Structures are given as C-alpha cells and as structure tokens.
C-alpha cells in the first residue's frame, strides 16, 4: 500500500458531503490494507493528523521556504520529529526532499496539508469508528470501547482487523495511553440527586479547573489535558509533586487542576490553561500561577484495571494510594444518605468559590467517554456550552480587518460536518477580536463576501439566556443571546458539545420551569 491509494481516498471523500458515502469510502480503504502498512499508520492520515493528540512527538514547519509509499512517509515523519538533537533546527528540507523527488504535484498538496495540519478532510472520529467496524466487520460497540480505553486509533484498528470481537473486548488499559473521561449529566438540586442515586450518594466539590489525567510509571509521569494534549513539559512542578505523593509505581489517576490564589482559593480555569500554553518561561509562570490538583478517581493501580470497580471502592483505594500534601489532595467528599449536610456541603463549596457539587453513584463502575446519570453536576447556574466556531463574519470599515461575529456549530451523529447551532457577537473585547481574527484567519474553508465558513478546529465556551427550538438553524436549535465566556483550548473538535447535548440541557431547562 502506497500514498496514491490514500490520495484516491482523499479525492473520493473530497467530492461528497454525505455521511455513509464517506463511511463507505474510508471503510473501503481500510479494507484495502494488509498490515506492514499496519494502520498504526493510516487512520491518523485519514483524519489528516500525523500522530495521536497525546503523542508528545511534534514536527511542523518556513513551509513557504521548504517549498522550493505510505510507510515511507510515516517513516519520514518519525525520522524528522523524533530526531532529538542539535544538528537540525530548520533543516528538514533534505528530510522533506528524501521522499519528494518522486512525489507527484497531485500528492504534494496533501503532504503539506498533513504537515501544517492544513488537511481539511471531513472525517470525524465517530465516522472512522463506523468505518473500522464496517471494514473489518466488528461490533462498533467494541471499536467504541477499545478506543475509549486507549485513544489509539491504530491500535484499535490492528486489533480489529486481526483479533476481532474477541480481542477488542479483551483490550485493556495501558499507561501512557489516555482513557476517555467518564462524564456527568446535570441535576436540579441536591435532594434530587439523592433521589436518582436511590437514597444515598457520594458528593464532591466540583472544582473550577482543567480535568487532567495522570499516568505514573516508575520515575516517568505523563499528564494529559481534557483535549488529550500532553501537558507534562509545561507543568514540571506538578510533575515532581505528583511523583512523591503517589504511592504506587504503576498508577493512572484523574483529577482537576485548579490555579489557586495563595489564599488557597481557585482562580478561573482560564489561568490553568495559560499554564498549559507555556507562553512565558516556566520559571516566571510557576510563581505567577500556582496550581493545586484534586484527584477524584483511580483508573489503574499496580497492573489492576479499576473501570469495573464501583465508585465506593475506587475512592477508598484512591485515598489509600495518595498521601496528600497541600499541593496534591484527594478531592473533598461526603457520603451521606440525607440532603441536609449535603446542601451544607453544597453551600460550603459555593462560598469556597468554585462551581458546585458532583454527585457520584456509589455502585457506579467507570464508563469512559460516557455522560450519564452515574455522575451528576449541581450548579447555581445553567451549564454553559463549549462549541466549535463553525464560521464567522467580518466587520465593516476600519473593522474590515476584524472578524466580529462567530458562527457556532455543534456535532450531529447523523451528519458529521457540524451543524450550526447559532452565532455570537456579544461578550468579546477588542483584543479578544484581534485574537480570534488572526487565529481563525488560516481556518477559513469558504469566503462569501464579508461572511466566512471556518474549518472547525476552535472550541469556545459561551453562555446563553435560553435554549429554544429554532429551525432557523439546521439543528432546529438556537441560543437566546449567546455571549463569549472563554475559548477552551483544553477542548478540541471531538470534545465539543453535541446536538443531543443541547437537547438534554433544554430538557433540564423546562424541568427548571416545571420544577421551580
Ligand atoms: N471533583 C470533580 N469530579 C468530577 N468532575 C469535576 C470535578 N471537578 C470539576 N469537574 C469538572 O466536571 C466535568 C464533568 O464532565 P463534563 O461537565 O461533561 O465535562 C469535568 O470534565 C471537569 O471539568
């Protein structure tokens, strides 16, 4: 298998907007591969990615300057990036020349697109899940599960094509390979949560921060953000910290990383994300923004997989496994059968100033990548939305050098390409708009007058007065007065709220009419 076949797939997919046609084309291409080509390989090329989001390997490039088989090209990619040492900085022109001499002007567009991540190919991860489970005739539930436990497409692809149902089912946790976050639905009040949970429950402060995941093996700690970027290199001090306070040698834990004031109180999560960016030099930053990490779960310890263990037990273990500093702590909990002290905790947590409560079903096992009623948020406010900036619209006059308005998409399982759920102009300052304009400019996949269709890689969090059903957008959904809250860089396109999400928040809302 070579790059011409994959190019032919890129073209086949170029022509259509239509879901199962794309599914069928990809799936066909995957069916077309025997695996020295292994498909460690391909799936990320199909996605247009190079390496998994969690890889810690980065090579990108002065692409206008460098401008004068498949296994060959993955090889090229590992051998450019990994390649850790001093003799090459720019370089890579000869590295990129090594393959390029026999490469067609046909393919070059896709090579460079892959390079700068300038590939716009419309394949969603769910569409690829469908594509794998088709091509290799496996239950998609399984490609689902194994993806949720690993977040390695290549891995689930090989296991699928070789071992099938079988092996996929048997697939388990691997350190340094991120497990997808189990997620919460919403609750009205405490007493309610207490009802759904069947009379008793865990309660936790819901902290305002970045959900992170920590993988400890020996003296090597890996820490991941919600968008599964490897944030280790950026937060060295929470590296050293998490080494010492974690008792086991092979662990995987989950927690909330909160920027705090020295008061011991949380700053807005926007700062913690500043810390991930590593804009300045970490010497300065580590003092300018201190961070505490409050662990709420244990996915793995000591060659043991905790997924299938109830909450109650996982919690006891978690407490057992960590001996806490002021810099690392097991997230504050209360297990009670009565709502009084519950809402006492709710208030204590509010006046502590983060978000709300979490309410954990005690007997709940862990379901990676699943919002459910096993976990439940309790907040003063209505949940905000993280959605992709789908399109935008410029300003006029002096503001013609500015994108003022932002077309916002959500994701639809029977579509793919991201249905629009609204447009948002309120909440931004000037520098906010210079930012968004400069940053979004590269991502424009269509230009109509002063309005623009964006290649949807950017997730912002916006609040809204009301959710209503409007088929003035495809979704039959719209937002009453959206406003910028922040851009969540710790979420990418596959992390953004779906349409069914909107549905559920709506349902909660009419229940907060009815229940009020
Ligand atoms: N102690 C906690 N336990 C669980 N989730 C938390 C906690 N503190 C903050 N959170 C947030 O709650 C979210 C629950 O999932 P969701 O709101 O669907 O993203 C997490 O992703 C975190 O951002």
Residue 102, beta-bridge partner list: none
- Separation of 206 CA from ligand 1 center, angstroms? 6
The domain made up of 178-378 has a fold known as D-amino Acid Aminotransferase; Chain A, domain 1 (3.30.470)
Which phi and psi (to 5°) does residue 32 adopt? -85, 5
Is domain 1-177 annotated with CATH 1.10.10.10? no
Distance CA 343, CA 185 (A): 19
Distances (CA, A) of 295 to 160, 318, 334, 380, 475: 33, 8, 15, 23, 37
Residue 357 contacts residue 345 (beta carbons within 8 Å): yes
Instruction: Reduce the DSSP state of residue 77 to 3 states and report it.
Output: helix
Give which of 208, 220, 218, 305 is closest to 265, Cα–Cα: 208
Protein residue whose Cα sits closest to atom 19 of ligand 1: 183
Instruction: Specify which residues 230 forms β-bridges with.
Output: 224
> Ligand 1: does its nearest atom lie under 6 Å from the Cβ of 379?
no
Cα torsion 59, 272, 355, 359: sign: positive
Write phi, then psi, for 150 (nearest 5 degrees).
-130, -50
Supply the residue whose CA is at minimum distance from atom 17 of ligand 1.
184
Q: 64 C-alpha vs ligand 1 centroid, how far in Å?
A: 42
75 near 96, Cβ under 8 Å?
A: no
Two structure tokens written together for 320? 């057992």
Of 506, 397, 513, the closest CA to residue 450 belongs to 397
- Annotated binding-site ranges for AMP: 204, 207, 211, 226, 256, 296, 360, 371
| 3-state percent breakdown (helix, strand, coil) of the chain, nearest 5 | 40, 25, 35
| Among 201, 204, 206, 356, residue to substitute to test ligand 1 (most atoms within 8 Å of Cβ) | 206
For strands 183-186 and 371-378, give the pairing. Answer: parallel
Please indicate whether residue 206, judged by its CB atom, sits closer than 6 Å to ligand 1: yes
Residue to probe by mutation, ligand 1, list 181, 193, 207, 224, most atoms within 8 Å of CB: 207
User: Is residue 207 within 6 Å of ligand 1 at its C-beta?
Assistant: yes
Strands, DSSP E only, in 282-342?
291-301, 304-305, 328-330, 333-336
Decide if 1-177 and 379-516 have a common fold.
Answer: no
Q: What is the CATH number of domain 379-516?
A: 2.40.50.140
Measured from the Cα of 205, ligand 1's closest atom is 1
Q: How far apart are CA 116 and CA 456, in angstroms?
A: 15
Asked whether the beta carbons of 236 and 276 are under 8 A apart, the reply is no
Give nearest CA residue, ligand 1 atom 20. Answer: 211
**Does the beta carbon of 331 lie inside 6 Å of ligand 1?**
yes
Question: What are the residues whose beta carbons fall under 8 Å from the beta carbon of 465, sequence distance 6 or more?
Answer: 479, 480, 481
The pair phi, psi for residue 270, each rounded to 5°, is -55, -35
User: Token digits for 233?
Assistant: 């290199």
Question: Helices marked H in 294-429 — which ranges?
Answer: 311-321, 339-351
Residues 6+ apart with CB under 8 A from 397: none
| Cα 198 to Cα 98, 202, 336, 360, 377, distances in angstroms | 64, 12, 12, 11, 16
Atom number in ligand 1 closest to CA 294: 1
Best mutation site among 358, 360, 366, 492 for ligand 1 pocket (most ligand atoms within 8 Å of CB):
358
User: Distance from first CA to last CA of the chain, Å, rounded?
Assistant: 62
Is the Cα torsion angle 110, 115, 120, 122 positive or negative in sign? positive
Residue pair 209/257 in contact (Cβ under 8 Å)? The answer is yes
Question: Measured between alpha carbons, how far is 216 from 242 in angstroms, rounded to an integer?
Answer: 9
Tell me how far CA of residue 297 lies from CA of 169, 250, 254, 305, 316, in angstroms: 23, 15, 5, 12, 10
Active site residue ranges: 206
The full DSSP string for 476-514 is S-EEEEEEEEEE-TT--GGGS-BHHHHHHHHHHHHHHHH
Distances (CA, A) of 114 to 5, 64, 107, 390, 454: 16, 15, 11, 21, 18
> What are the tokens at 500?
């069914």
Structural resolution in Å:
2.8
Cα–Cα–Cα angle for 448, 452, 457, nearest 5°?
A: 150
Q: How far is CA 491 from CA 210, 274, 287, 469, in A?
A: 10, 14, 25, 26
Domain borders along the chain are 1-177, 178-378, 379-516
Residue 307 and residue 323: Cα distance in Å, rounded? 22
Residue with structure tokens 């989950």?
Answer: 254
Residue 256, ligand 1, Cβ within 6 A:
yes
Residue 296 CB–ligand 1 contact under 6 Å? yes
Which residue's CA is the nearest one to ligand 1's atom 23? 211
Does residue 438 contact residue 481 with C-beta atoms inside 8 Å? Answer: no
């Amino acid at each position: 298998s070579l790059y011409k076949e994959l190019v032919e797939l890129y073209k086949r997919l170029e022509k259509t907007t239509l879901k199962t046609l794309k599914t069928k084309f990809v799936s066909d291409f995957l069916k077309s591969v025997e695996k020295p080509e292994l498909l460690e390989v391909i799936p990320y090329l199909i996605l247009g990615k190079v390496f998994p989001d969690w890889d810690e390997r980065e090579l990108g490039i002065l692409l206008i300057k460098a401008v004068s088989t498949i296994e060959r090209v993955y090889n090229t990619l590992v051998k450019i990036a990994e390649a850790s040492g001093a003799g090459s900085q720019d370089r890579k022109l000869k590295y990129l020349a090594n393959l390029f001499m026999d490469a067609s002007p046909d393919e070059g567009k896709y090579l460079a697109r892959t390079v700068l991540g300038i590939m716009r190919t419309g394949v969603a991860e769910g569409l690829l899940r469908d594509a794998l489970a088709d091509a290799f005739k496996v239950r998609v539930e399984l490609v689902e599960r194994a993806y949720m436990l690993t977040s390695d497409f290549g891995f689930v692809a090989k296991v699928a094509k070789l071992e099938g149902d079988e092996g996929l089912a048997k697939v388990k946790i691997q350190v340094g390979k991120p497990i997808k976050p189990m997620l919460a639905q919403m609750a009205a009040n405490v007493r309610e949560a207490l009802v759904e949970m069947g009379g008793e429950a865990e309660f936790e402060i819901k902290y305002d921060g970045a959900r992170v995941q920590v993988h400890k093996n020996g003296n090597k700690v890996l820490i991941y953000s919600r968008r599964l970027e490897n944030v280790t290199k950026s937060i060295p001090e929470v590296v050293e910290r998490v080494k010492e306070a974690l008792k086991p040698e092979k662990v995987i834990v989950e927690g909330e990383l909160v920027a705090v004031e020295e008061t011991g109180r949380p700053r807005p999560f926007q700062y913690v994300l500043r810390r991930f960016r590593r804009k300045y030099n970490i010497e300065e930053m580590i003092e300018k923004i201190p961070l505490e990490l409050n662990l709420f779960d244990i996915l793995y310890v000591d060659g043991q997989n905790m997924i299938d263990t109830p909450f109650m037990e996982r919690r006891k273990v978690l407490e057992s496994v960590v001996n806490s500093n002021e810099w690392i702590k097991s997230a504050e909990n209360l297990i009670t059968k009565s709502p009084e002290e519950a809402e006492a905790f709710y208030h204590k947590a509010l006046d502590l100033g983060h978000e709300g409560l979490m309410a954990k079903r005690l007997d709940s096992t862990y379901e990676p990548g699943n919002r459910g009623k096993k976990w439940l948020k309790i907040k003063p406010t209505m949940e905000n939305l993280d959605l992709v900036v789908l399109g935008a619209e410029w300003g006029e006059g002096r503001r013609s050098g500015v994108l003022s308005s932002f077309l916002l998409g959500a994701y639809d399982p029977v579509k793919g390409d991201f249905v629009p759920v609204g447009k948002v102009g309120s909440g931004f300052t000037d520098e906010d708009l210079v930012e968004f304009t400069k940053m979004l400019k590269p991502l424009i996949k269509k230009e109509h007058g002063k309005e623009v269709e964006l290649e949807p890689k950017v997730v912002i969090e916006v609040a809204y007065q009301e959710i209503q059903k409007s088929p003035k957008y495809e979704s039959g959904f719209a937002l009453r007065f959206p406003r910028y809250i922040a851009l969540r860089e710790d979420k990418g396109p596959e992390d953004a709220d779906t349409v069914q999400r909107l549905a559920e928040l709506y349902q909660f809302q009419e229940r907060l009419k009815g229940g009020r």
